[PDB]
Design a protein around this nucleic acid. Structure first.
Lengths: 103, 150, 267, 116, 62, 125, 95, 252, 189, 328
RNA sequence: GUCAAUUGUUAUUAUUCAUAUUAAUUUUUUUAAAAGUUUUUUAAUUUUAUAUUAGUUUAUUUGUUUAAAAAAUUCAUUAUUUAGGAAUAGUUAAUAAUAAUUUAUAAUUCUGAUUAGAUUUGUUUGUUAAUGCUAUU
């Protein structure tokens, strides 16, 4: 679901669910011979901690000193188990745990 | 007595006369371990061992002067028992030596109880008022009543 | 080794044959074969009629190299001896005993992950591993796998006993591998980690209680709050561990006290 | 700082009328009469680490018919004070240690003894 | 009144999987005036929008 | 801070003052107030609504570790869960437990729930 | 089973008793279906009996509501045509 | 300090005694905990109480698994019997004949057509279930009817699960299917047991209400050994020991 | 009551057996019900055995996916029909369809036991909808499998025209089952 | 250097927030306009609280104590209704004792409409009232004199009530096993299916066991008699008559100890004598010295009667209203 | 659904660590303060109930009318400090209104107990951008 979201934001060329249990393949996409994904980091460096995100804790991020700023992309796993980007996550105003960030 | 005078008819009419009924073990429950009942709504009735109240009279050494208080023993009574067993039955539940100092004949309202009879002939239930008189009821009026400290 | 454990090694020296359970199954299921097999007796038989007899190639252990005893008949006795269970290397003698025992407890004949099978497969290895280790006392390479095998032993046993204790008693009693099962210590037993292992395995609720202790008493009423016992008392059921004598004598006294009161206070 | 974490196993399975009303755990000790020692998990959540750990404790519960054999899963509840340390009663046993009854039926202890 | 609001609840009532009745599943939906043309277009989403997003710079004319 | 009307609804309307009337109360350690947002209650709310239940590693894990539910460190179901256990997979749980409460009918048939009194017949006409 | 309901009245068009019996079931509120379960039954059936009760409970509402408008559906004609709600049930397309 | 300043005996309240009269008129005394003794310490278990209208009628027939001889049950309980006639010779008129020891499952007040239908019914109720030869492991003695009966308490370990359905299987049928009275009419699980002792109604005046605790306090939780039962038997209790056993009129 | 699928538990398979007897009783004799257990045959040597072998709906899942299992087997003589109540499982369903080896496997085995000529054995199948029954099924059942004089159909089944259960869209694919590709026995069943 | 957004997005469950959750600039412009939209009490969600097994009964008694205790002298007749609400507001589902306690207390206080309000509340709470409760509301309906009420309540709840036929067995034994959870149901069914508060509709199956059907047709005929609708009264009272003679005696129901004052052991020796004061002869708890302030018929409840005696009593109960109908 | 925002002049680099601000002791007259409580017929009797001590980390828990004013209890779960760590002891449980010599062998403890050291157990502070560190009765 994450690659599905990053794809729709264009950070990756295109994923594919080979339906292999172990691993699927995602095509990176480069611009200016520089990878599109500058800084991508998993939210919880440890699995034991699973940080959840209020619909306001995300909304504060979109505003970098007064300008609605959708540069960074955060992925959230909703309670309904919908892998959703933080942008849509505030749209329908629902929270979820935080998987990773990318920008 | 309104509750009791009421349930007097369930005695016969609820269980004795109906030639048809059933009694269902399971969902026929008992008391809890939170020291109380649990709010269900029914019971026809039954009490095999009727708890009998037996009230006594014994003196206690108050700081000022001797005085006698009402030590009542609540004994479980077999509804088919003779009173001679009752007087025998009660003596072990004294819990205080000062109660059963000697023989005593149980009494109702001053009219003594006939031991060879059962509780059915006397018709004794819980609310029946059974005093208990020691042999020395004649004593304790004579000047050897009890020795106090002056 | 110990009296119980060495009892198996006796059956290893002269080996072990197929149990009749396999050879009788083959008959009551494939009548034309068993009629054909006992008809071709002694003759060099050019077709493997007994193929269904030995399904897995390792299910052949009576002779060497998993060469089925039936193939050898048409030859001279000199050959039938060279492959006898007598002339096996010890490394095979384990695989002869293993494939024999693991066959007995195999609920699924081809399976090698059934907790009964997986148990015996390591269980017998531990003995002959201990058999080796004590004889020549110092061999570090052997000692390490002894930790690896007991781990795969206990992980199998604590998982097995929940599946069926009946089979399970055979795995512990016959080989006396109980010593590795004995709880690691008091702390890991006091805090429950000895019991919580069944939880951390996932076989906590896997009993199918309909076999023993009909659940009509194991569940106190939620409406009422009655304890476990009261719902058995009201149903007339009894669920008591067979008492120790420690709890037996103290329970006799409790039952006699207020009767013993009728003894003492008649004086 | 270590703050009590109510959200846990026993909280999620059972509606607890108040805090820690009911508990669930393995029967660690049946040596004492009518008293099955149980080890259960009460959660503590670290806000600093943001990770929560389990601190397991020992509770006593009262089983009337001596129904609890070593190695059982019991669903106990709180109740009136029975002794200095018993305030629990074994409300129900979920998982009976079948061996424990059978290993006693043979005539042994319901569990092999510890090593140390 | 967001998502944490108490659930509004279902509308219909179909207890089983073995809910088999044709001529059903039609009972869920049972749908003068001088409306302004533009608005009846805009109300149905067929009308060409003009967001703030099509705004260039506000130029200094004076 | 959390409001105080949270206290009443969980325990009882005006349960506070009755508790205050205690002789030995508040000295030295008082019984503090149960002010916890209604969706964060330990007991009533399920996993899908209470976010804290959605914790896995020491939370839902032990459950599926007990129930036998095939569970992973992360998966498709709610909390570290992959597939149903043998029990859930085989047994019908529609009508097991508390019977379907009668007050549900109030929903589909709503004429029953009606304000008996005019809100203006309170003294504010 | 069969032996119980034994009184016989053959004077019944397929519709009359049904349409009549429907009306009583039509006015039925939901609580009418509360205690229809036979009490003393096994969890094997105390489950299965409740389910089958929900199916009938489902179908009655179907034959109640989906027929409820039908009377109105007939009445829409009467309110427009001015004829008996009975005769509409037989009027044709050519009509 | 040595004893509790207000021990449990001061931590008891009773509802029949009006709290506010027994507390606010004078001191009440009673051996309360004796009254609150759990049915586990006494082993007084609640068999189905028959409707009073059936209580005037006396049992005619009984369906019962007759105990197999040579089994560990007797040689343990006959060891108890000799141990009990040793303790009190008075128990010998009370004791149940060791010839008549058997599992008591059902009490029915029946004549032959009634016998035949059940003969088909239990001949089917077993065949509807087709159970394998039952094995019931007994352990722990207990009391019925306020002590007037002492029975072999049947633990629910070995095979009781497939069994107690048999009780409910016939009880549904013999009671409600066809018109056969029983003490436990409403589908009820009759506690199956072997009555080791039984006070006769005439003997109640001879020996008293309660069979003495001291007689069975020793083997209150004795382990009576699993016995394999294969044949259910319906019998009339009119005779005594016709073949060492009561008159047999059915089996399966 | 069962054919309409209202019997949500144990759906209509045993009742189907009764119907087939009734569909066959009125056919020849009212004194027909010779139920010597699972076999309910006719004796006129125009054999109409109504042998029901087992419960496909409730056994093909748990063991031995023996697709050949005819929930009912009704031989008409030369034609050897099989009536199988199709499993709700879209998966097991293709393990109820008898395969070519099973067809000629049974046919060459029924020719011996029943004396039917080897050439004229014409074995066929019929799978009803899983949980309910449809109106077309009853018709093509009483019209081809249990060949019935159409007038006697009204006699034996008066409510035939009154039947209205039409196949729900979800379960129209109850019939359109495809043979797995010969090289894909791993992935497909 | 670790991202500042992480340094915030990491500690979302920071103990500062924990205080604001309660786990252990400010003008009107900022607050959303959508605030004023929420209708009254829509903000509250459902609440399924489990209370202690004992405290289920204690809390009921205190409610049972106020309702049947409201009409003492001070508390308003309305008060009996206000205590029924405070229970329901706090999710204690109101049991049938708390219903009868209201209708009885309210009728005693001349409040008839309010006595119906308690009946609509249990019509709102969708609690099916048992026969004992059904007859209660009909009793106020008699004082209410409305045929329109009883006829309404008749169809809804007491439709299938049938007289105990001679062949039917007798008052049904208890069939409702108390709510017990097998471990399987406990571990796997969701929370909302494992909460049990005593719903009043749970024992209504067995609350009808003692077969008080006869008191129904009488109260209904009484209402038909009260509203001058005797055309209905005959059909009811006639149907009551024919069955009152042929059907057996309906087994009278023992008194519910929750409702009625069950007597309790007490030492009655420490009682003030009748002439405790010199000034007047007192009526002590033990013995009566002034006598009965009321002439008592001395008869037990109408349910304790025989099968015929009820019928002739039904005439007495009927004609007493014909008095009051005329007297009102 | 309206406020998270970091300011030391260093001194090869590694390593939170001298000289900074904030808040405190230094730091100073603008909040205390002395005795005799008081009734009452009885030399008496009614009414006059928790600051300041000494040493406690498995610890501290509660009211029948007193008052008010005209069947509610003695129990509990949790959380508990020492750098380098081993035993504890009028015992535990069951009887019971036993048990100065009943009955068990029990109970605590390395999941860190007991003794010893310091500390009165904290909706209270300060610092901060802040999980934190750092106080308080």
């Amino acid at each position: 679901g994450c690659a599905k979201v990053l794809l729709d934001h264009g950070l990756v060329a295109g994923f594919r669910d080979f339906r292999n249990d172990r691993a699927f393949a995602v095509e990176l996409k480069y611009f200016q011979n520089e990878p599109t994904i500058n800084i991508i980091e998993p939210c919880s460096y440890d699995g034991k901690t699973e940080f959840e995100w209020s619909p306001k804790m995300m909304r504060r991020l979109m505003n970098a000193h007064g300008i609605h700023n959708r540069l960074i992309i955060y992925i959230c796993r909703t309670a309904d188990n919908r892998i959703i980007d933080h942008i849509q996550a505030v749209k329908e105003c629902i929270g979820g745990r935080g998987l990773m960030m990318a920008h | 007595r309104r509750f009791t005078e009421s349930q007097t008819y369930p005695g016969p009419i609820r269980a004795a006369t109906p030639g048809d009924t059933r009694f269902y073990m399971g969902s026929a429950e008992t008391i809890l371990q939170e020291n109380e009942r649990h709010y269900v709504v029914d019971d026809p009735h039954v009490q095999h061992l009727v708890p009998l109240r037996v009230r006594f009279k014994t003196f206690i050494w108050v700081t000022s002067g001797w005085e006698q208080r009402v030590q009542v023993v609540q004994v479980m009574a077999q509804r088919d028992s003779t009173i001679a067993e009752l007087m025998q039955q009660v003596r072990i539940e004294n819990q205080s030596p000062y109660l059963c100092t000697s023989s005593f004949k149980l009494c109702i309202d001053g009219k003594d109880l006939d031991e060879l009879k059962t509780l059915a002939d006397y018709g004794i239930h819980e609310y029946s008022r059974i005093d208990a008189i020691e042999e020395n009821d004649h004593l304790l009026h004579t000047e050897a009543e009890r020795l106090k400290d002056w | 080794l110990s009296p119980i454990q060495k009892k198996k090694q006796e059956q290893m020296l002269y080996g072990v044959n197929i149990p009749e359970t396999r050879v009788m199954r083959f008959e009551q299921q494939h009548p034309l074969l068993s009629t054909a097999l006992t008809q071709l007796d002694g003759q060099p038989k050019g077709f493997p009629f007994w193929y269904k007899k030995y399904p897995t190639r390792r299910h052949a252990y009576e002779q060497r190299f998993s060469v089925p005893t039936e193939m050898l008949e048409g030859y001279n006795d000199s050959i039938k001896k060279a492959f006898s269970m007598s002339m096996m290397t010890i490394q095979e003698k384990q695989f002869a005993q293993e494939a024999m025992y693991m066959e007995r407890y195999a609920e699924h004949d081809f399976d090698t992950t059934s907790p009964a099978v997986l148990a015996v497969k390591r269980a017998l290895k531990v003995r002959v591993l201990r058999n080796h280790l004590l004889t020549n006392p110092h061999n570090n390479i052997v000692k390490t796998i002894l930790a690896n095998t007991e781990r795969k032993l206990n992980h199998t046993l604590r998982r097995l006993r929940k599946v069926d204790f009946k089979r399970y008693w055979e795995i512990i009693r016959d080989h006396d591998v109980q010593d590795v099962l004995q709880p690691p210590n008091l702390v890991t037993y006091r805090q429950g980690s000895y019991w919580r292992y069944d939880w951390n395995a996932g076989l906590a609720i896997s009993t199918q209680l309909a076999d023993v202790l009909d659940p009509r008493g194991l569940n106190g009423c939620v409406e009422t709050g009655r304890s476990r016992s009261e719902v058995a008392r009201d149903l007339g059921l009894s669920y008591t561990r067979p008492l120790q004598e420690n709890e037996k004598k103290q329970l006799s006294e409790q039952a006699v006290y207020y009767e013993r009161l009728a003894k003492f206070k008649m004086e | 700082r270590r703050m009590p974490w109510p959200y846990d196993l026993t909280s999620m399975i059972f509606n607890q009328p108040r805090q820690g009303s009911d508990k669930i755990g393995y029967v660690v000790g049946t040596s004492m009469l009518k008293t099955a020692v149980v080890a259960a998990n009460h959660m503590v959540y670290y806000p600093k680490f943001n990770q929560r750990v389990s601190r397991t404790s020992r509770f006593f519960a009262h089983d009337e018919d001596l129904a609890c054999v070593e190695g059982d899963l019991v669903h106990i509840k709180q109740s009136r004070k029975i002794s200095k340390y018993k305030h629990y009663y074994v409300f129900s046993i979920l998982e009976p240690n079948i061996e424990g009854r059978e290993r006693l039926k043979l005539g042994l202890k319901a569990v092999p003894p510890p090593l140390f | 009144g967001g998502p944490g609001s108490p659930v509004k609840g279902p509308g219909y009532y179909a207890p089983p999987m073995e809910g088999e009745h044709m001529r059903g599943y039609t009972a869920e939906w049972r749908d003068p005036e001088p409306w302004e043309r533009k608005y009846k277009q805009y109300a149905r989403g067929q009308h060409p929008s003009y967001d703030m997003v099509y705004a260039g710079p506000m130029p200094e004319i004076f | 801070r959390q409001p105080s009307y949270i206290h009443d609804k969980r325990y009882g309307l005006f349960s506070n003052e009755h508790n205050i009337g205690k002789s030995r109360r508040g000295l030295p350690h008082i019984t503090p107030i149960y002010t916890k947002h209604m969706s964060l209650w330990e007991t009533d709310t399920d996993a899908s609504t209470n976010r804290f239940f959605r914790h896995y590693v020491f939370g839902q894990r032990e459950e599926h570790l007990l129930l036998g539910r095939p569970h992973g460190f992360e998966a498709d179901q709610a909390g570290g869960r992959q597939g149903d256990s043998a029990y859930e997979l085989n047994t019908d749980q529609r009508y097991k437990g508390v019977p379907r409460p009668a007050i549900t009918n109030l929903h589909y048939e709503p004429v029953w729930n009606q304000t008996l009194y005019r809100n203006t017949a309170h003294g504010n006409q | 089973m069969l032996a119980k309901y034994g009184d016989l009245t053959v004077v019944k068009d397929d519709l009359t008793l049904l349409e009549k019996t429907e009306s009583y079931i039509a006015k039925w509120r939901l609580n009418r279906w509360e205690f229809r379960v036979p009490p003393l039954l096994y969890p094997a059936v105390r489950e299965k009996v409740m389910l089958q009760q929900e199916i009938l409970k489902a179908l009655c509402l179907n034959r109640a509501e989906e027929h409820k408008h039908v009377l109105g559906d007939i009445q829409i004609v009467a309110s427009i045509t001015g004829i008996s709600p009975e005769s509409v049930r037989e009027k044709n397309r050519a009509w | 300090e040595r004893g509790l300043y207000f021990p449990i005996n001061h931590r008891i309240v009773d509802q029949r005694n009006t709290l506010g009269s027994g507390a606010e008129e004078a001191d009440i005394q009673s051996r309360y905990r004796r009254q609150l003794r759990s049915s586990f310490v006494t082993r007084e278990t609640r068999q189905t109480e028959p409707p009073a209208w059936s209580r005037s009628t006396r049992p005619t027939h009984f369906l019962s698994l007759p105990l197999p001889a040579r089994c560990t049950l007797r040689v343990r309980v006959k060891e108890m019997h000799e141990s009990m006639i040793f303790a009190n010779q008075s128990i010998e008129p009370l004791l149940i004949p060791a010839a008549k020891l058997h599992v008591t499952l059902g009490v029915m007040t029946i004549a032959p057509d009634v016998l035949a239908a059940i003969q088909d019914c239990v001949g089917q109720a077993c065949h509807d279930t087709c159970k394998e030869p039952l094995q019931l492991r007994f352990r722990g003695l207990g009391t019925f009817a306020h002590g007037r009966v002492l029975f072999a308490g049947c633990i629910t370990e070995a095979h009781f699960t497939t069994l107690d359905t048999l009780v409910r299987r016939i009880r549904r049928d013999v009671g409600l299917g066809l018109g056969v009275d029983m003490k436990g009419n409403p589908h009820d699980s009759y506690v199956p047991h072997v009555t080791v002792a039984k006070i006769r109604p005439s003997q109640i005046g001879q020996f008293g209400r309660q069979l003495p605790i001291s007689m069975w306090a020793d083997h209150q939780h004795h382990d009576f050994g699993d016995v394999t039962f294969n044949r259910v038997d319906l019998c009339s209790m009119k005779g005594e020991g016709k073949d060492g056993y009561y008159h047999v009129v059915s089996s399966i | 009551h069962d054919f309409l699928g209202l019997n949500v538990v144990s759906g209509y398979r045993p009742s189907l057996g009764r119907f087939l007897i009734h569909c066959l009783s009125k056919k020849n004799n009212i004194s027909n019900p010779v139920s010597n257990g699972r076999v309910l045959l006719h004796v006129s040597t125009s054999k109409e055995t109504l042998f029901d072998y087992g419960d496909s709906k409730n056994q093909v899942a748990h063991d031995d996916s023996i697709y050949g299992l005819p929930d009912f087997m009704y031989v008409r003589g030369n034609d050897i029909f099989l009536i199988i109540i199709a499993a709700d499982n879209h998966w097991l369903r293709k393990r109820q369809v008898p395969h070519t080896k099973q067809l000629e496997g049974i046919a060459r085995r029924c020719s011996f036991v029943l004396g039917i000529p080897f050439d004229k054995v014409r074995i066929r199948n019929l799978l009803l909808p899983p949980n309910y029954v449809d109106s077309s099924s009853l018709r093509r059942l009483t019209e081809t499998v249990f060949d019935m004089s159409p007038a006697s159909v009204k006699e034996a089944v008066p409510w035939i025209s009154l039947y209205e259960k039409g196949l729900d869209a979800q379960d129209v694919d109850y019939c359109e089952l495809e043979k797995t590709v010969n090289e894909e026995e791993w992935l497909t069943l | 250097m670790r991202d500042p957004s992480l340094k915030i997005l990491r500690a979302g469950s920071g103990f500062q927030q924990l205080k604001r959750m309660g786990m252990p600039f400010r003008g009107a412009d900022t607050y959303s306009v959508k605030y004023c939209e929420q209708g009254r009490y829509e903000y509250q969600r459902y609440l399924m609280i489990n209370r202690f097994p004992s405290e289920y009964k204690r809390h009921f008694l205190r409610f049972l104590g106020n309702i049947r205790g409201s009409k003492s002298r001070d508390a308003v007749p309305q008060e009996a209704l206000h205590w029924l609400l405070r229970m329901i507001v706090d999710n204690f589902n109101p049991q049938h004792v708390h219903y009868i306690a209201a209708m009885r207390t309210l009728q005693d206080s001349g409040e008839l409409d309010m006595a119906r309000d308690v009946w609509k509340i249990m019509e709102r709470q969708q609690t099916w009232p048992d026969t004992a409760t059904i007859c209660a509301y009909l009793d106020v309906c008699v004082e209410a004199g409305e045929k329109t009420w009883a006829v309404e309540a008749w169809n809804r709840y007491c439709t299938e009530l049938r007289f105990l036929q001679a062949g039917e067995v007798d008052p049904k034994p208890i069939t409702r096993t108390p709510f017990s959870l097998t471990r399987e149901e406990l571990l796997y069914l969701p929370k909302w299916k494992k909460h049990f508060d005593h719903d009043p509709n749970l024992d209504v199956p067995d609350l009808n066991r003692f077969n008080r059907t006869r008191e129904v047709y009488l109260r209904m005929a009484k209402v038909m008699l009260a509203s001058d609708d005797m055309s209905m009264f005959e059909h009811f009272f006639d149907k009551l008559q024919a069955a009152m003679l042929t059907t057996p005696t309906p087994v009278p129901e023992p008194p519910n100890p929750h409702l009625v004052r069950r007597p309790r052991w007490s030492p009655y020796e420490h009682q003030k004598s009748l002439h405790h004061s010199p000034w007047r002869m007192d009526n002590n708890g033990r013995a009566m010295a002034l006598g009965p302030s009321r002439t008592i018929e001395g008869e037990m409840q109408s349910r304790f009667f025989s099968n015929p005696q009820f019928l002739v009593h039904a005439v007495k109960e009927a004609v007493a209203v014909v008095l009051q109908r005329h007297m009102a």
